[PDB]
Design an enzyme around this catalytic site. Structure first.
Site, PDB file in Angstrom:
ATOM      1  N   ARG E 114     -27.811  -3.423 -32.012  1.00  0.00           N
ATOM      2  CA  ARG E 114     -28.461  -4.253 -31.005  1.00  0.00           C
ATOM      3  C   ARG E 114     -29.977  -4.245 -31.119  1.00  0.00           C
ATOM      4  NH1 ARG E 114     -23.758  -2.916 -29.453  1.00  0.00           N
ATOM      5  NH2 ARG E 114     -22.553  -4.127 -27.929  1.00  0.00           N
TER       6      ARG E 114
ATOM      7  N   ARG F 142     -15.133  -0.315 -29.126  1.00  0.00           N
ATOM      8  CA  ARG F 142     -16.043   0.617 -28.454  1.00  0.00           C
ATOM      9  C   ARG F 142     -17.490   0.307 -28.846  1.00  0.00           C
ATOM     10  NH1 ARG F 142     -16.511   6.127 -29.701  1.00  0.00           N
ATOM     11  NH2 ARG F 142     -15.380   5.546 -31.610  1.00  0.00           N
ATOM     12  N   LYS F 143     -17.701  -0.830 -29.503  1.00  0.00           N
ATOM     13  CA  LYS F 143     -19.041  -1.231 -29.925  1.00  0.00           C
ATOM     14  C   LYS F 143     -19.711  -1.996 -28.790  1.00  0.00           C
ATOM     15  CE  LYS F 143     -17.451  -1.764 -34.700  1.00  0.00           C
ATOM     16  NZ  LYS F 143     -17.064  -2.785 -35.714  1.00  0.00           N
ATOM     17  N   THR F 144     -19.701  -1.377 -27.619  1.00  0.00           N
ATOM     18  CA  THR F 144     -20.273  -1.955 -26.415  1.00  0.00           C
ATOM     19  C   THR F 144     -21.744  -1.583 -26.242  1.00  0.00           C
ATOM     20  OG1 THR F 144     -19.410  -0.048 -25.216  1.00  0.00           O
ATOM     21  CG2 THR F 144     -18.071  -2.045 -25.262  1.00  0.00           C
TER      22      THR F 144
END
EC number: 2.4.2.19
Lengths: 267, 267, 267, 267, 267, 267
Positions: E114, F142-144
């Site tokens: 990100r 789980r790539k939050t």
């Protein structure tokens, strides 16, 4: 007077309840999604003989879960379900959205079962001590469950026992390590007095008789024998009462049996 | 494998230890001021027969209190002080500033006594179940002490028992309230499945026999009788074992007796 | 003994330092980006006559900012920069990355200036009281700055004064409101004693003479006149000393002047 | 406009009030237990001449303690108790359970006394500066009390002074260390501008005259002499005003005298 | 200069990393128990063309997970895996206990993917604007992800863009609601100036031409058209550049594509 | 059933909203001071085609900011502003003090834009998969975004996708590292089963065919191929559907475009 008034209208203890709720739901409450929000009625049941304790803590859980509750007994009341046909007594009537009730249920009951357990064990040991004509006090200890000290101490009080010192900041307790660390009981007491000041008592664990007149001379407020000024006996055991002022036991609060409670929705 | 590896190198659990320390010192540590910082040696003693549990938690207390510790036994080891002349076994040797050791002492011991208690009660009940030739599992419950769930569940594991579901977010548990809330066990299971997805199991409390084939048909993973798919019995009681897969009891962890530990500085 | 030992190796107070740091940098430290991380040397300077206080708190700021510090004086030392040519005294030598030093600088100095101020005002008032041959104690109050109670009380001690009760949990203080709330000083004292137990003192504010023998008879530990058992006088004012045991004043800590400190990098 | 609107309806500041409450009750409120919950009336009294400040902060304490309050004056109003027979002015009427009122009382008063003190010192210094025909601004500093920055800055504003930069994230301040760290005032300003961007000002402490045209040429927004673009003078002292735009002093907020307030229940 | 120096040695941001770790392990790390603590080697791989960003944040995750890391590129370096045979570039070499590495892995990668995404989108839009000969600035907005503002703003800077105002406390932004709330742009600006003081800029959204000379006359620092003093254009869109000083777009940071990273243990 | 019921009446998620508010106001809300507290009306507008998501989170922001809101659509409703003349749809009507509305506005919108974005991308990918006659499930990962996991997972559900495992505590996932760490898939599964117990599933990433019958024989609940028992395919890509039970993709939630929302006061 009312024991629950010992808890400040607001403070850390209410955040503890919030954290206990989070401990149960770290992501999502799947059961709540399925049960929905229809208003429901429910009864909190006491399923074992003992003293009711932990009301304001349980009440706070119910408050945060936005429920309406009617307690049928005063905190401290001794409940006797075995006088029952059914084997249980409803100590509270709860109303609110189904999901909210089921959310509050385990945490609230975990509070009541343990708090009442401590109160019941506390009341049992003091009423017992009282029956022999003992006029002194039975006190607790600092061997409380990590994070639950406020609740367990509160329960001790409800059960009719003395709490003893709350923490390491509360009443100073000097031992061998402290006495030869300073040089003498007199030095230990003086240094301790030099920092705690007049507002807090100093208790010194004495093993000898000349280990205790000095402490009394140093200005110690409490003297412990360990197996103007008060006298304390640390051990417990049972069945021994003489004229000491304080008898301490972790028995009234640690490794204590719980009082079983339950909760069931009506319909 | 090592049980302590279940705890993440860092996370909320370490902050819990810090908060347990604060619970004991809200202002000042008067005893620490009097005892000073001279390096001291000390032995942690196990004073009752039972299984050692809570090592990494106690170790974290020692770490934060900046001490050096040498554990003499592996976590889970069954200790038997009564094989002793002295009546105790040193399970750890600690070194550090006197004040730091005395600061860590109560909190660390409160952890060990309770953790070992749960482990010991857990191991006793499962070894007992195992002795009858039972091949299923003995599980815990959610009736844990508020705020101490991580520690108590961990202790259950060490004691050799199944933990059962950790929380309300973990494996879904449907009951009567959930089943008629949706219309049928099939509806309850479907809605639950609609939100928990494939990654988590759904357990349904069934009282009847047609209350259980439907659940099994709905896709339920576990079925509870309450006094491909597994079978669970909720009650405990003792002395009853048939062919159920899971027998649950709060007995292995709630209202459990503690294992007494102690700590004394040398010199 | 060493005053800093009153602070637990770890606890809430260290998190306070972290929060003080965050209070100064809610987003980004632009000055730190421009100054860089080159190792630098720096001297902490005391620019006004007074007693050095707040060392361990300032030290914790330096620790968290990862710096190396050498204190040139013991906490409590009375510094006199005006004996100087320069008008200042270096009380510490600091080394570390330039950005880190400049990050620590304001927060650390805000601690020292205020802590020393309280200590200096405290020491001035007690040495003054001591000069008249007064043998009693000069105590502080609960009129401390919100959030900084631990630091201010600590400073009171360093300055040589009594801290008085730390908080509402510490030594009970009954007044008119409490006495007629229960019915009589005897009732107020009893109820208070019923919950604080033996480990904590009870102080009653008495205006009359029959308002004070009753309290003494009820078991009160301290009696206040307000403008076995100790006697306290609440007002202060100055220039009055009789034979009371305690004279309390918010003057030693509230609305107190600060001792100016500074910090400058070398090169 | 209303100063209290500067505080967000909800945010960290309200949690600060909760923490201030906890700072006073780490275990139990013994006095609250004895006084009970009977509804009572009470007046908040201002006992010294000064400007009322800290209303919304005190109000939040009262809110959390679940009380009902009626402020008799607007925040910022200059109160003059010495125009009194009695020597005091009631600035608020409070109603609620006795225990709650007595719980709120010290914390709320500690807020008012200090906030008003800062406001009063702030207003005194600016009205004074204003009297000489000075049209510039008198600003505060970052030498605020650890943890109480929001409150003290707010008080500065109420008192009529400029707050100056809130923190290290707010308006960049370059000094000698920053200028030679980059090579030149121009380099310092550029690097600073490279990260703070257009939205935030850059202030450079200049000692020379060629140390200041460069900064102005680099794009600096404010120039400090330290004892399009604004000019600031750092020292204070008093009695000196020329044509600088900003005169900064920690005198309006640090080591400042408090305004005495009190609270008494009626009946 | 080094962008990571914008982050204070210690502060809230490091606690954020701890909380991100807790978000992934609310109870137990089962995979960690099975993998154990044997030291392992591992490579962090960049699997898509873009600018590396988020190094110090990822580094903090690795620090807390007690690992040793060697970054192969400087933060901000533009990576081009597609110049590869393999389709990836190792940007870091990690060593530590297997469980610790696997614990850090997802959280650290979620940061990098990100952060780099924002930096890459930021750099792409500014280099693009730069290519037309535009000399002004491209700024971000406050439409950041809740809780991740510090990280996203930091990424904007690395990408070469202006951050714009950090929050509501930072540079004041007046609109229609604020202007007629006070009566006139002049009143809005004055009231705003009355509280933010000299240290912070005031920006006014102007729609007309007489809506903007007044603001400039009131002392506004920045003027926005919205689709001494700077000029800003709020909309973005692309392909329009005139002579405004600032062009703002949430495009450089919101709804932005991520840069794929990976991590694999060797052996 | 209602998705918002997945959120506990109270818990950490509400404190997250408070922290998001603080992230926007670390000191003072200058714009709020200028706009005042006059009651105002306002409409929340959806400016792009997509599914409405994040209602209860946004609602909590509005609650804490003490506003009154009327949602015009149910969460999950698919909105199509482009069917509009105006290009937007009002999804909510808000009323409250002007300052409060403007305080809530950015944070609430940042929630809605991102939550709806995830829901929209989620619904698009599953409806697409559904159109080919695929009967399996499309799951997340789980790539939050760090700190926003609860919100993003919730959005996945609303969008009609499976959430997959919430965290490392949830359903165990064994890989190569875990399998040879124990010796064999059978050993990996057993150790994992030894600690997660019956209540949680174990998924094993299998590359071979004999790497998968063993896992199935060990008792694994889910088997992954990675590019009684369920089958999962990890890669995504698109346009491939066979008879696997689960297809996972970070595409439904990571690097996802946002749905633009807005808010404007009336008058």
């Amino acid at each position: 007077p009312v024991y629950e008034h010992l808890l400040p209208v607001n403070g850390a203890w209410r955040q503890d309840v919030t954290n206990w709720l989070s401990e149960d739901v770290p992501s999502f409450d799947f059961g709540g999604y399925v049960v929905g929000s229809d208003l429901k009625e429910a009864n909190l049941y006491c399923k074992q003989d003992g003293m009711l304790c932990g009301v304001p803590f349980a009440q706070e859980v119910f408050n945060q879960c936005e429920l309406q509750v009617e307690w049928l007994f005063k905190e401290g009341s001794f409940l006797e379900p075995s006088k029952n046909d059914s084997g249980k007594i409803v100590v509270a009537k709860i109303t609110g959205p189904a999901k909210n009730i089921l959310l509050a249920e385990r945490t609230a009951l975990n509070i009541l079962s343990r708090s009442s357990g401590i109160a019941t064990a506390s009341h049992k040991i003091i009423s017992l001590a009282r029956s022999t004509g003992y006029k002194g006090t039975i006190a607790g200890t600092r061997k409380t469950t990590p994070g639950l000290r406020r609740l367990e101490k509160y329960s001790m009080l409800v059960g009719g026992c003395d709490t003893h010192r709350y923490d390491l900041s509360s009443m100073v307790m000097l031992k061998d390590n402290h006495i030869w660390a300073t040089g003498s009981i007199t030095n230990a007491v003086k240094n301790a007095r030099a920092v705690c000041g007049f507002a807090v008592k100093i208790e010194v664990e004495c093993l000898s008789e000349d280990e205790a007149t000095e402490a009394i001379e140093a200005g110690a407020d409490v003297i412990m024998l360990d197996n103007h000024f008060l006298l304390e006996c640390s051990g417990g055991l049972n069945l021994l009462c003489d004229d000491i002022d304080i008898y301490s036991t972790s028995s009234i609060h640690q490794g204590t049996p719980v009082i079983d409670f339950s909760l069931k929705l009506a319909h």
